[PDB]
Amino acid sequence: APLSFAQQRLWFIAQMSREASGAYHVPGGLRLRGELDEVALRAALDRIMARHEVLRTRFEWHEGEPVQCIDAEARFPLVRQEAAELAHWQQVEARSPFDLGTGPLIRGRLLKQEHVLLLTMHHIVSDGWSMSVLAHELGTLYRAYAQEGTAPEVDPLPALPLQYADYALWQRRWLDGERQQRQLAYWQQQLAGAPALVSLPTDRPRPALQDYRGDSIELTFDAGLSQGLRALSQRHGTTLYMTVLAAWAALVARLAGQPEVVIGTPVANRQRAELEGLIGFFVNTLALRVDLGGEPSVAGLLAQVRERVLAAQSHQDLPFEQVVEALKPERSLSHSPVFQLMLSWESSALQMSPLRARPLAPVRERSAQFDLSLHLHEAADGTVAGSLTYASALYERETVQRHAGYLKALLAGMVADDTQPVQRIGILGEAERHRLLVEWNDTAREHPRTVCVHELFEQQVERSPDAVALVYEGQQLSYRELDRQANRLARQLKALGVGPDERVAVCTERCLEMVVALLAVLKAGGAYVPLDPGYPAERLEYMLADSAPKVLLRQSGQTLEPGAGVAVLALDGEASQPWQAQPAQRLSRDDSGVQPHHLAYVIYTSGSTGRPKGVMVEHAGVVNRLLWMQRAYGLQPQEAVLQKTPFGFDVSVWEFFWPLAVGARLVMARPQGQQDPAYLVETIVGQDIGTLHFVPSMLQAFVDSEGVQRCRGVRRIVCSGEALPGALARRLRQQLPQVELHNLYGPTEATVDVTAWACDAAELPDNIPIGRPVDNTTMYVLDAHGQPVPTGVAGEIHIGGVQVARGYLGRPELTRERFVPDPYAGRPGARLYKTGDLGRWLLDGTLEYLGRND
């Protein structure tokens, strides 16, 4: 049961109101493990109450603007009430709403020698630094009150040199002057043109409204890495924070595929020594734009980050909100402005001045104001530890864990060699590298590697010679009748010099004799070259001359004349009768001499921008492609497949030879029949079609056609050639609830298809994946240097395995460029095909097509 659009909208808005409850509070606590002297503690809390003027301040509405009201004689409120209770009592105290009109804006919690001294302040009167000052004065005041009786333990001995209202009066005048205008001018130029949104790969699409649900992981830099990072930063004059910022920016730019990254950082903004002991709202945010173009070195990047961090810290008085208003007066509501990743660097003055006061550790962060929030601090033992909070709507936990692993690996590389290119440092762990290269390519399947394409058909003829094999416009041929017709023509082709790796061009519209021709060429040991008569004459004549075939099989009525010594054989009509005198028995395997490594066909590319390339495809890869398809989908002998794809596209290869290898019948659609919506529906129903192919644009026309809901006998619809929108997949489910939808992907240079994804999930994604590699086929997503990229990162798709084509006919240079040695398979001579397509691995080990690399 789904919510309406207005219900879902109001829910996300109502939970953003839940974000405005605890995200504006500054919680904290201390553990008391000593004598119970609550008489001195209450005097210590009330002493810091009356001393720090901001703690006894309320806020009202007075004539169209908020005003502050400083009250006198403020009493500290404290409530008096193992693992489950302390955790529940903590965050509910941290999520306790305060009243800004009445106060108090600072509360506490305590109960029963060991006690729990919880404390919470509102962000309008405090910040991160304010809790450290609150804990500083509490330990000193409880100590002085535990020594002997006092009345002003902190009022005359260390008084406040400046109150928060004095700071606000100074800031009100500073914001009106020119110093504020110069700092705004710097930030205007420093961040002009920066990317508005980091393109970090997300496990789920970014919601329309920013989801603030968060979770966090812990990460640690051991003493070895921390020591090396300290020495690295001393050598380059950077701080330990600058070195981590340089590494994280280098990692994010590499993961996102963007030249520069913006990372925010909160600063204390207490540069003047007059404010360092004050309690109040002082924290400001700085946006750090780190550029990684030009492939810098580790040393060069550290010098850039050192430069821009010092420049940012010189202009840190300007409020970050005024930077956002100047840069992005119009801003998206699905992500934070200017930056979406924050890096906070915490420190380690004093600690526990009273007695046995332990700093209570904060609860695990569950609110995500940004996409990623990296918190780090230098522990006492020199090790660097912290947390990485992530937005649950965007990332899964394992993705964030691998993200932290890349950062630690990149930091170790920067220590190992600060002179190397920073963006080529290895970051993948061995576990993920093995999963990407091996585990997700575990497709080895035992198929007979000694059988050719036509022999699969011949083996089926012996199993069911009288079953129906081919249907065309009221005519039909059994398996035996089709085999005999192909044998006669194959012997005629053999008499004309057809043999291993020789080409035979075939120019015909769809009919029974089209399949006779294709099988006869294969039986004669040659490779067929489909010449679609619908193509322009210039294109047909080029492919006819480029392929240099021994024979042209031509349908009667076609006028294509090769000349050049090419033998022309009539495919049908009265002129084809002479080769009916050939014996109908099969040619022996030695008579043709064809082997699985010989060519099965040469199919030319589109030639959209130049001359088409003849893709040379061998028998063994086609056999693997066909045997996988039967293992995946289980086509049965009583089923029918529709031959509707023009046979110049290699999708027709499985339309032709998959049913004929397994006992099903192939229904040859009328020429250009797929373009008639009425004919397609009537043929599907009339001929009991169970399986057919659509490019997504034509599947859209199919589901929009009249009477599409009559096709409830359809079993499988295979999609390939374009991106398949999830909306179209859902639309097909509504029209035909029984049909199985499968999304396939693969170029001609890798034998028809190499990945497949069944669209059988209860809820389908907006972008249908291309899936997992097929049998004996491998897939790789590599960067510009041939290295595997992290999971989710976009790179160029590479294809390995037995289906990689032999190359381009007559174009050895281009073949060497796109068919490169395979460095993974462990097989000598194996090759990868560079697709020129962009893609990425998903979490579940499925591939996603992202477009062309250029």
Side-chain angles (χ1 to χ4, degrees), residues 1-17 19-30 34 40-46 49-54 57-62 64-72 74-79 83-106 108 110-111 113 115 118 120-147 149 151-152 155-156 158-159 161-168 170-171 173-347 349 354 357 359-368 370-588 590-853:
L3 285 74
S4 62
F5 187 89
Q7 284 182 319
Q8 178 268 357
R9 255 303 200 279
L10 183 53
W11 173 266
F12 273 89
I13 296 178
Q15 302 317 100
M16 283 173 53
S17 67
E19 181 254 43
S21 71
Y24 306 137
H25 298 344
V26 185
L30 278 166
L41 174 132
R42 291 164 116 254
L45 299 174
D46 303 19
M49 208 76 165
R51 191 152 93 90
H52 282 275
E53 195 174 62
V54 73
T57 302
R58 302 174 297 100
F59 305 91
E60 293 179 324
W61 276 100
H62 270 170
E65 85 172 295
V67 301
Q68 57 166 328
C69 313
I70 300 178
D71 285 354
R75 156 177 154 91
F76 192 99
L78 180 136
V79 291
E85 283 271 277
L86 182 64
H88 170 270
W89 235 241
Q90 210 167 141
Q91 37 196 319
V92 178
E93 166 67 30
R95 281 274 164 174
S96 64
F98 298 151
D99 186 294
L100 267 50
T102 70
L105 301 184
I106 167 177
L110 189 83
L111 58 104
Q113 276 284 318
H115 312 285
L118 283 177
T120 308
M121 307 179 67
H122 196 281
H123 206 343
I124 200 176
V125 300
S126 63
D127 57 0
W129 190 290
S130 301
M131 194 65 195
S132 298
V133 176
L134 186 75
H136 263 82
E137 298 189 3
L138 217 175
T140 60
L141 267 49
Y142 181 85
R143 178 144 122 186
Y145 287 149
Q147 299 161 8
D155 299 324
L162 201 67
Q163 289 299 338
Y164 192 81
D166 316 326
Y167 160 79
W170 165 89
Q171 187 187 59
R173 185 175 65 256
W174 182 91
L175 296 166
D176 201 18
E178 192 218 338
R179 302 146 78 185
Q180 182 269 357
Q181 204 218 285
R182 296 197 77 98
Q183 292 195 8
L184 185 68
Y186 161 75
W187 284 117
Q188 172 66 43
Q189 267 279 356
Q190 166 63 22
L191 300 167
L197 174 65
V198 53
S199 68
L200 271 180
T202 61
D203 298 321
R204 284 168 293 275
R206 182 175 301 269
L209 266 54
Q210 183 175 359
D211 195 332
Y212 293 105
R213 289 178 302 109
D215 205 336
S216 61
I217 67 173
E218 294 274 289
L219 77 165
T220 303
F221 305 157
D222 54 5
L225 180 62
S226 303
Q227 172 184 335
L229 284 176
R230 295 181 189 274
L232 172 64
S233 32
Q234 294 230 30
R235 168 208 238 260
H236 292 271
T238 67
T239 69
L240 195 57
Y241 157 80
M242 294 176 183
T243 306
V244 176
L245 175 62
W248 200 23
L251 172 58
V252 171
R254 185 173 177 179
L255 298 177
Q258 289 171 319
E260 44 187 351
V261 177
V262 185
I263 292 182
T265 294
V267 294
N269 196 21
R270 300 163 179 251
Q271 289 179 121
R272 279 153 265 256
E274 332 142 14
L275 316 161
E276 302 185 357
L278 247 178
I279 285 182
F281 200 159
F282 287 89
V283 178
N284 196 21
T285 301
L286 302 178
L288 295 144
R289 178 180 181 178
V290 180
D291 190 4
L292 279 118
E295 244 259 304
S297 60
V298 175
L301 178 63
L302 287 174
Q304 172 196 160
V305 172
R306 186 191 200 276
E307 223 188 295
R308 304 188 182 186
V309 170
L310 296 176
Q313 293 173 355
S314 296
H315 304 63
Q316 73 178 250
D317 292 81
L318 180 72
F320 177 68
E321 297 84 350
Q322 294 183 334
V323 179
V324 176
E325 295 170 341
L327 271 44
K328 281 285 178 178
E330 312 196 66
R331 38 197 284 193
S332 174
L333 303 188
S334 60
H335 59 82
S336 56
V338 181
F339 69 91
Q340 299 78 43
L341 315 168
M342 188 172 64
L343 169 60
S344 306
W345 190 262
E346 290 112 24
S347 55
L360 175 129
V363 71
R364 221 175 70 172
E365 181 64 275
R366 306 306 293 262
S367 176
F370 312 103
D371 289 6
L372 296 174
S373 188
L374 178 58
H375 307 168
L376 290 175
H377 69 274
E378 291 168 277
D381 54 3
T383 67
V384 177
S387 61
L388 179 51
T389 301
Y390 60 93
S392 291
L394 307 180
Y395 309 103
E396 289 288 307
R397 189 169 187 87
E398 55 161 297
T399 303
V400 184
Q401 291 178 311
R402 291 189 308 270
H403 187 102
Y406 306 147
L407 176 62
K408 299 168 62 178
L410 182 56
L411 287 160
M414 296 171 58
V415 175
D417 191 357
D418 50 53
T419 69
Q420 65 180 320
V422 61
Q423 293 299 81
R424 299 182 67 174
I425 298 180
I427 58 178
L428 286 183
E430 180 56 38
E432 176 178 19
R433 178 183 171 91
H434 183 265
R435 176 169 60 255
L436 290 168
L437 297 181
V438 174
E439 300 176 8
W440 289 353
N441 278 322
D442 183 51
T443 62
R445 183 71 57 168
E446 198 79 313
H447 294 309
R449 309 169 213 85
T450 61
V451 58
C452 296
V453 174
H454 57 283
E455 305 183 310
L456 296 175
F457 166 73
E458 300 170 341
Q459 289 167 8
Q460 186 57 46
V461 173
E462 298 308 300
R463 287 189 292 260
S464 64
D466 294 321
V468 181
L470 199 62
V471 180
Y472 175 73
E473 298 275 43
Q475 307 174 269
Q476 65 178 238
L477 296 172
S478 69
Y479 269 85
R480 183 68 69 185
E481 297 173 320
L482 172 58
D483 191 65
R484 292 167 60 83
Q485 285 298 314
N487 290 335
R488 290 196 177 105
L489 183 56
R491 294 176 176 273
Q492 194 84 352
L493 295 172
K494 219 70 195 69
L496 291 171
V498 177
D501 280 2
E502 299 291 345
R503 280 77 62 199
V504 179
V506 181
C507 181
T508 178
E509 301 287 346
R510 273 198 294 269
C511 55
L512 296 175
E513 288 72 26
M514 170 180 284
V515 182
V516 174
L518 266 53
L519 288 174
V521 175
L522 299 171
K523 284 164 170 289
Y528 75 89
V529 184
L531 299 185
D532 191 320
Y535 279 140
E538 160 268 347
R539 170 61 63 86
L540 292 181
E541 290 169 10
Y542 176 84
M543 295 178 295
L544 189 51
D546 181 77
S547 59
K550 282 289 184 180
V551 177
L552 165 64
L553 292 171
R554 195 180 60 180
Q555 182 178 37
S556 289
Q558 308 293 339
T559 59
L560 192 61
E561 290 289 351
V566 174
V568 174
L569 267 185
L571 189 46
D572 55 8
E574 296 187 348
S576 71
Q577 297 165 338
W579 54 264
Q580 291 297 321
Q582 290 283 6
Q585 285 71 43
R586 187 184 69 194
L587 289 170
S588 66
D590 285 14
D591 266 319
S592 80
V594 65
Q595 310 280 31
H597 81 269
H598 288 135
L599 295 185
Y601 57 82
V602 180
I603 284 180
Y604 283 76
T605 57
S606 65
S608 59
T609 59
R611 296 165 289 172
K613 327 294 193 298
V615 179
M616 299 181 297
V617 178
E618 302 178 355
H619 275 271
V622 186
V623 168
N624 183 86
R625 172 60 180 79
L626 299 169
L627 292 184
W628 161 80
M629 203 168 192
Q630 175 66 1
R631 189 183 72 85
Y633 306 131
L635 187 64
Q636 297 305 313
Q638 40 274 135
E639 300 192 59
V641 175
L642 187 62
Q643 216 286 283
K644 58 180 286 292
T645 303
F647 79 144
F649 299 108
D650 71 343
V651 167
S652 62
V653 170
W654 69 255
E655 293 183 0
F656 284 132
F657 303 111
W658 177 27
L660 297 181
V662 302
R665 68 183 183 278
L666 178 62
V667 177
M668 302 292 292
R670 181 175 306 167
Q672 295 78 55
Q674 70 277 21
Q675 313 298 336
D676 196 323
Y679 168 84
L680 181 57
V681 167
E682 294 294 336
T683 303
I684 287 172
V685 176
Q687 300 302 135
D688 293 329
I689 301 301
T691 300
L692 69 166
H693 176 269
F694 284 109
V695 297
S697 59
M698 294 306 295
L699 177 60
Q700 179 72 56
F702 179 60
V703 303
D704 291 335
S705 61
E706 164 94 314
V708 60
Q709 300 188 24
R710 300 170 56 202
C711 305
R712 292 179 174 172
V714 177
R715 288 274 295 103
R716 312 165 190 85
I717 286 181
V718 178
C719 273
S720 69
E722 306 166 2
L724 178 56
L728 178 56
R730 277 184 295 271
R731 180 69 189 279
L732 178 64
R733 290 187 174 181
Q734 303 162 16
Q735 303 281 50
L736 299 178
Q738 89 293 347
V739 66
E740 301 172 21
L741 181 59
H742 300 284
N743 195 40
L744 274 60
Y745 160 87
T748 307
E749 295 87 332
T751 316
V752 186
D753 295 293
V754 288
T755 70
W757 196 74
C759 301
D760 55 10
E763 287 192 328
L764 292 169
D766 295 325
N767 181 22
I768 298 297
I770 57 175
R772 299 180 173 89
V774 302
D775 291 353
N776 303 309
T777 299
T778 55
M779 302 295 285
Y780 304 92
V781 179
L782 307 179
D783 61 7
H785 301 285
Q787 312 299 325
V789 300
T791 300
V793 177
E796 178 173 359
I797 298 172
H798 293 60
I799 303 174
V802 69
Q803 293 187 191
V804 175
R806 188 191 292 185
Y808 298 117
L809 176 57
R811 300 173 132 275
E813 281 196 39
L814 186 61
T815 299
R816 181 175 292 271
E817 297 180 16
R818 297 185 179 180
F819 295 83
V820 298
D822 190 332
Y824 313 105
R827 308 172 181 176
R831 294 161 306 118
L832 298 176
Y833 176 67
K834 310 173 67 64
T835 63
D837 297 328
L838 281 184
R840 76 191 190 107
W841 283 104
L842 295 182
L843 270 192
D844 57 352
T846 64
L847 287 162
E848 183 174 57
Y849 175 80
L850 300 176
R852 291 295 295 174
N853 192 18

